[PDB]
Design an enzyme around this catalytic site. Sequence first.
Site, PDB file in Angstrom:
ATOM      1  N   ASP A  69      -3.091  -0.742  10.654  1.00  0.00           N
ATOM      2  CA  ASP A  69      -2.056  -0.288   9.723  1.00  0.00           C
ATOM      3  C   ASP A  69      -1.897   1.228   9.693  1.00  0.00           C
ATOM      4  O   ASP A  69      -0.779   1.726   9.538  1.00  0.00           O
ATOM      5  CB  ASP A  69      -2.393  -0.753   8.303  1.00  0.00           C
ATOM      6  N   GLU A 195       5.064  -1.961  -2.718  1.00  0.00           N
ATOM      7  CA  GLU A 195       6.143  -2.217  -1.767  1.00  0.00           C
ATOM      8  C   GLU A 195       7.420  -2.668  -2.476  1.00  0.00           C
ATOM      9  O   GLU A 195       7.989  -3.722  -2.193  1.00  0.00           O
ATOM     10  CB  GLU A 195       5.686  -3.237  -0.713  1.00  0.00           C
ATOM     11  N   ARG A 210       5.916  -6.356  -5.007  1.00  0.00           N
ATOM     12  CA  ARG A 210       4.861  -7.241  -4.541  1.00  0.00           C
ATOM     13  C   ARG A 210       3.662  -7.090  -5.472  1.00  0.00           C
ATOM     14  O   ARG A 210       3.164  -5.974  -5.680  1.00  0.00           O
ATOM     15  CB  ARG A 210       4.493  -6.902  -3.089  1.00  0.00           C
ATOM     16  N   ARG A 289       3.957 -16.319   7.109  1.00  0.00           N
ATOM     17  CA  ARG A 289       5.212 -15.594   7.320  1.00  0.00           C
ATOM     18  C   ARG A 289       6.045 -16.274   8.413  1.00  0.00           C
ATOM     19  O   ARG A 289       6.376 -15.718   9.467  1.00  0.00           O
ATOM     20  CB  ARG A 289       4.909 -14.137   7.631  1.00  0.00           C
ATOM     21  N   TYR A 324       8.161  -8.869   6.660  1.00  0.00           N
ATOM     22  CA  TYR A 324       8.697  -8.159   5.509  1.00  0.00           C
ATOM     23  C   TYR A 324      10.204  -8.353   5.370  1.00  0.00           C
ATOM     24  O   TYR A 324      10.916  -8.654   6.330  1.00  0.00           O
ATOM     25  CB  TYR A 324       8.410  -6.665   5.637  1.00  0.00           C
TER      26      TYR A 324
HETATM   27  C1  LIG Z   1      -0.333   1.359   3.433  1.00  0.00           C
HETATM   28  C2  LIG Z   1      -0.763   0.078   4.079  1.00  0.00           C
HETATM   29  O1  LIG Z   1      -1.769   0.006   4.769  1.00  0.00           O
HETATM   30  N1  LIG Z   1       0.006  -0.982   3.844  1.00  0.00           N
HETATM   31  C3  LIG Z   1      -0.243  -2.288   4.425  1.00  0.00           C
HETATM   32  C4  LIG Z   1      -0.326  -3.367   3.340  1.00  0.00           C
HETATM   33  C5  LIG Z   1      -1.474  -3.173   2.363  1.00  0.00           C
HETATM   34  O2  LIG Z   1      -2.716  -3.343   3.046  1.00  0.00           O
HETATM   35  C6  LIG Z   1      -1.369  -4.161   1.201  1.00  0.00           C
HETATM   36  O3  LIG Z   1      -0.095  -3.985   0.599  1.00  0.00           O
HETATM   37  C7  LIG Z   1      -2.447  -3.999   0.147  1.00  0.00           C
HETATM   38  O4  LIG Z   1      -2.412  -2.706  -0.446  1.00  0.00           O
HETATM   39  O5  LIG Z   1      -0.570  -4.630   3.977  1.00  0.00           O
HETATM   40  C8  LIG Z   1       0.501  -5.011   4.846  1.00  0.00           C
HETATM   41  S1  LIG Z   1       0.255  -6.725   5.353  1.00  0.00           S
HETATM   42  O6  LIG Z   1       1.254  -6.988   6.341  1.00  0.00           O
HETATM   43  O7  LIG Z   1      -1.078  -6.814   5.860  1.00  0.00           O
HETATM   44  O8  LIG Z   1       0.430  -7.509   4.171  1.00  0.00           O
HETATM   45  C9  LIG Z   1       0.595  -4.034   6.005  1.00  0.00           C
HETATM   46  C10 LIG Z   1       0.822  -2.624   5.472  1.00  0.00           C
HETATM   47  N2  LIG Z   1       0.778  -1.629   6.585  1.00  0.00           N
END
Ligand SMILES: CC(=O)N[C@H]1[C@H]([C@H](O)[C@H](O)CO)O[C@H](S(=O)(=O)O)C[C@@H]1N
Length: 387
Positions: A69, A195, A210, A289, A324
């Site tokens: 991420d 988000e 979310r 998803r 998403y």
């Molecule tokens: C800033 C960051 O790392 N955002 C990530 C989020 C986050 O880990 C969750 O909102 C929990 O805070 O997760 C998603 S996901 O697709 O894994 O659901 C992927 C995103 N890149």
Amino acid sequence: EYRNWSKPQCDITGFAPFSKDNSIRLSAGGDIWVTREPYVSCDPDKCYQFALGQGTTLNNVHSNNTVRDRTPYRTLLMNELGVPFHLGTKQVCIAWSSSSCHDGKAWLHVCITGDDKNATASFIYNGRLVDSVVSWSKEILRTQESECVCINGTCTVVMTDGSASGKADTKILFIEEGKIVHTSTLSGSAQHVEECSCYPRYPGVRCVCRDNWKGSNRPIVDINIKDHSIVSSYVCSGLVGDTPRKNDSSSSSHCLDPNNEEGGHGVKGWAFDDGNDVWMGRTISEKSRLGYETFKVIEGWSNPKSKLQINRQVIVDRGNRSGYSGIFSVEGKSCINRCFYVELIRGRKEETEVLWTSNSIVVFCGTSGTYGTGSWPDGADINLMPI
Ligand SMILES: CC(=O)N[C@H]1[C@H]([C@H](O)[C@H](O)CO)O[C@H](S(=O)(=O)O)C[C@@H]1N
Ligand SMILES: *[C@@H]1O[C@H](CO)[C@@H](O[C@@H]2O[C@H](CO)[C@@H](O[C@@H]3O[C@H](CO)[C@@H](O)[C@H](O[C@H]4O[C@H](CO)[C@@H](O)[C@H](O)[C@@H]4O[C@H]4O[C@H](CO)[C@@H](O)[C@H](O)[C@@H]4O[C@H]4O[C@H](CO)[C@@H](O)[C@H](O)[C@@H]4O)[C@@H]3O)[C@H](O)[C@H]2NC(C)=O)[C@H](O)[C@H]1NC(C)=O
Ligand SMILES: *[C@@H]1O[C@H](CO)[C@@H](O)[C@H](O)[C@H]1NC(C)=O
Ligand SMILES: [Ca+2]
Ligand code: NI
């Protein structure tokens, strides 16, 4: 010249096809960026697609392990909508979490990068850095991953810092020409907020978000632009919009509390009100998803017992991957229209035939006309892709 969005919401009977970029199919015969967390936002003339690049193209040794991420190589990509992320794409800032919006005169970009426990958010307006803020809770400062909203020159953006599975510290920043002029703390009944998909609802801004902690019903955050006040609740609809969630027969919801039904984790999503009815999209699978559907829940905006849906449309059939989704708003001659994009995720970890993780997008807009049926999935043959 500043946008004020002071027109009524358009009449909406459903959504019609608007755009698709086919980026993964193209990736197999061309140099295309690896992305995730895409979104759409429009200046007063035309729309743009955004995404978080991974600092690499897909057919490229550096696409390995792009399921990660947060890296210092992620940047925010920006093209006109429908132009895929080719090597001429502009990286508008360094970011592993972003929001952008146009106030009628210029673009604002909110870009978060750096250490997990000590991230920085840069605020870039009209092509120059105007402000920055540090992580306040030292636990992955993050933001909307879809467009912010500006009224009369004041733009608003929702940001969270702290636990993804517990109480966290959410703040609503007010930004004028890129300068943070005020900050408000999340207040009200929403217990976890990430988000946010926000839209203009003159005279204010309304967001559907979310809950990653206890809710499979989505939080609502309402933002008063004038006095900076905040209130928050949850989408009442007994058909809930998060993933994961319970099935339609056994799920339930509250207007002022998380429903505690498969609450942990989630996925960025959206909804918007039309009187006491609610338009919302969600994955078709309640656990994964897979697929994407939209529909109207009659009295779903005010009645938490209603599961009475109508005007369903399949956007992505249940056999294909989604991801998403988020809202954006487009000003028309006499009303404000609501549109949404859907991220079509391919690759790791769910598909192991390849080493990378990326997405394409498809986009639909509200219509007051009529429309048919279909399915607009990613369409790439993962078994024949570069690894
Ligand atoms: C800033 C960051 O790392 N955002 C990530 C989020 C986050 O880990 C969750 O909102 C929990 O805070 O997760 C998603 S996901 O697709 O894994 O659901 C992927 C995103 N890149
Ligand atoms: C989140 O991010 C924020 C923002 O980035 C972080 O806050 C910043 O943290 C910085 C690090 O502490 C801080 O800079 C420091 O400021 C102090 C003054 O308070 C200053 O002394 C520091 O400089 C010394 O330390 C750095 C290492 O951090 C060394 O690289 C540097 O050379 C300095 O060390 C030298 O001088 C010291 C003299 O006291 C000696 O102790 C040391 O041995 C060393 O001496 C050698 O050089 C000397 C010449 O200077 C020489 O006389 C001697 O003989 C040796 O050769 C450093 O600049 C920022 O000010 C701060 N920013 C803000 C806005 O607050 C925050 O920590 C992050 N938080 C988390 C949780 O990650
Ligand atoms: C991809 O990365 C993993 C570790 O992150 C490594 O073990 C593996 O060999 C890499 N694959 C390729 C093809 O480089
Ligand atoms: Ca959830
Ligand atoms: Ni309850």
